[PDB]
Swiss-Prot record:
Effect of mutating D122A: Reduced binding to C-degron with an arginine at the C-terminus. Abolished binding to C-degron with an arginine at the C-terminus
The keyword Repeat is annotated on this UniProt entry: yes
Pathway annotation from the record: Protein modification; protein ubiquitination
Superkingdom to which the source organism belongs: Eukaryota
Name under which the protein is recorded: Protein fem-1 homolog C
Extent of the ANK repeats: 1-27, 36-66, 78-107, 111-140, 144-173, 177-206, 209-238
Phenotype upon changing D73A: Reduced binding to C-degron with an arginine at the C-terminus. Abolished binding to C-degron with an arginine at the C-terminus
Documented effect of changing R117A: Reduced binding to C-degron with an arginine at the C-terminus
The keyword Acetylation is annotated on this UniProt entry: yes
Coiled coil: none
Source organism: Homo sapiens
GO CC terms, sorted: Cul2-RING ubiquitin ligase complex; cytosol; nucleoplasm; ubiquitin ligase complex
Domain notes: The first seven ANK repeats at the N-terminus (1-242) are essential for recognition of Lys/Arg-Xaa-Arg and -Lys/Arg-Xaa-Xaa-Arg C-degrons.
Amino acid sequence: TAVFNAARDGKLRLLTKLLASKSKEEVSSLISEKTNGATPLLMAARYGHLDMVEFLLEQCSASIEVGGSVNFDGETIEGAPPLWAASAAGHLKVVQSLLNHGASVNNTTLTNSTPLRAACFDGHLEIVKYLVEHKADLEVSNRHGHTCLMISCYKGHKEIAQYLLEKGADVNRKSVKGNTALHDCAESGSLDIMKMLLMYCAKMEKDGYGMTPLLSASVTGHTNIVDFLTHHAQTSKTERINALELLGATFVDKKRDLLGALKYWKKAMNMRYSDRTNIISKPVPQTLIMAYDYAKEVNSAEELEGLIADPDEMRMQALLIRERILGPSHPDTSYYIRYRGAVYADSGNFKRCINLWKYALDMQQSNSSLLSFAELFGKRLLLGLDR
């Protein structure tokens, strides 16, 4: 009835007032009642009321595996059992108690997120170890194929990632979109974790977008990952050049730092022309692009030194570089075409703005729906990066 708000907030004396003036068998169905999606035990465990939890189990352990709505960071998560909620929130003693009463360490939310995964999200090292020691399966992933190892590297949790690897987590797992734990390290800039995965011979692979961890780091702008990986023997000379040219474009468009962009473009131009036996010349696109003002990529160290006095030329180089390396189906390509058009509109160049926006629209229509104009004006559950 209202004994659901009782367990939700922890007052055990309020609850037991009704549990004495109750039935030895219909106290059962009062606690097994979904009040706004959640059982009373689900909310006692969500909010860490250890004594509320052990009293409710000693009455009736029927709701121990039933999941419902629970709230985290404002948003509501569905089908979450009590052990899961206790581990997302960090209540270790609750977790230890639910297991003592035979809760299933493997029962998941409807995204197929295990108790282990939720504990690794928020960094609860001491819950993670207890779950693993109570036979949690390290390799159960969510419905996108994202693992506990991937999420703990994406979040930067070095100690947790280290423990999972010591317990035998497969370092080369791939999600359904081809993401490996080395990609998550590249996206979060966790160089120290990336080095630790390489101690287990983690293989660098292209994901669905065709991104290696190196290219993923040049996209998100993590220069520590790019500097490390472009001196790693598992990346070829051509992949280094492209990663540095892509990183420069990211400097232009995301970091708004044209001096750092040139530093990376010069580094790349030198490697192209370092070995005079074998020139590595820029590929040639099928046609010149009106939205790019018909620019073409610089092809020599000399065309590079004039660019710093030409911010507009650098912005077109960045777009050429990004369309060449990432291609038309990568969301950042049309995103930064639109952003560059937006900057031109804000400076009065409505024709350049419109031609850029026309092109970005023709691009995505001849081939990530949270990057429309309407949605940018009005997020990670779409990518499977959620709890």
